[PDB]
């Protein structure tokens, strides 16, 4: 299919915009080319069941959570978007795990990525839950859907999260404020950034990806 050859070439162009030594961020000056590329792939009939290259999921995660910053990073806590982001993050982790199974020690790097991944994922789910609990009235249907898909299926945690959605708004807000202070977003920003950088390094060093990590691998 020539449409498939065109789509693959659009993917190669996005690679040169998306792959960074550090974290991707959209520049106003690149917005038209990047957007035109994404839209072309998004409506390309031959890409509907193609696998998303991992560099695209990584760029999405860096853009979605604004990993280029370290301040309020203008994260859009919307249920549908954050649910897609978690699925994307899981695809990344899935692919990182396969890389490890086929200068750096594998056992150490895999363990570090797994710990960062698990912390980052729990932080994202909790802050999505916080956003749900801070609205009045609560969107209980999507709140519940989100907790089944992504809330760690522990007895007494989902026990309590669903009781708390039934507290009144002033109490929900006091409780959410306390837990946000106990666990600020800046910690999960750092963990998630380090997860992405750890993953980029492992993929380049141990498999045939290029994530422009040459200047980091060398200092080992």
């Amino acid at each position: 299919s020539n449409e498939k050859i065109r789509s693959q070439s659009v993917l190669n162009t996005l690679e040169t915009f998306f792959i960074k030594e550090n974290h991707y961020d959209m520049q106003r000056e690149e917005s038209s080319i990047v957007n035109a590329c994404l839209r072309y792939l998004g409506y390309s009939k031959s890409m509907c069941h193609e696998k998303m290259p991992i560099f695209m999921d990584i760029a999405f995660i860096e853009y979605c959570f604004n990993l280029s910053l370290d301040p309020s990073q203008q994260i859009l806590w919307e249920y549908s978007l954050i649910s897609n982001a978690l699925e994307r993050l899981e695809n990344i982790e899935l692919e990182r795990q396969n890389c490890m199974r086929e200068l750096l020690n594998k056992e150490t790097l895999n363990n570090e990525a797994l710990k960062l991944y698990s912390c980052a994922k729990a932080g994202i789910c909790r802050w999505m839950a916080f956003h749900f609990l801070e609205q009045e009235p609560i969107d209980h249907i999507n709140f519940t859907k989100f907790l089944q898909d992504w809330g760690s299926h522990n007895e007494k945690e989902m026990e309590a999260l669903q009781r708390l959605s039934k507290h009144k708004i002033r109490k929900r807000l006091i409780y959410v404020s306390q837990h946000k202070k106990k666990m600020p977003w800046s910690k999960f920003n750092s963990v998630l950034s380090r997860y992405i950088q750890c993953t980029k390094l492992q993929l380049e060093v141990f498999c045939d990806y290029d994530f422009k990590q040459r200047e980091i691998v060398k200092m080992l």
Binding site: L109, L161, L164, M183, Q197
Partner: peptide
């Protein structure tokens, strides 16, 4: 032997209560 997680860093998240 530590590159991305720092020695003694706590990446375990409190449960909700």
């Amino acid at each position: 032997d530590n590159i991305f997680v720092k020695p003694g860093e706590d990446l375990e998240i409190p449960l909700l209560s």
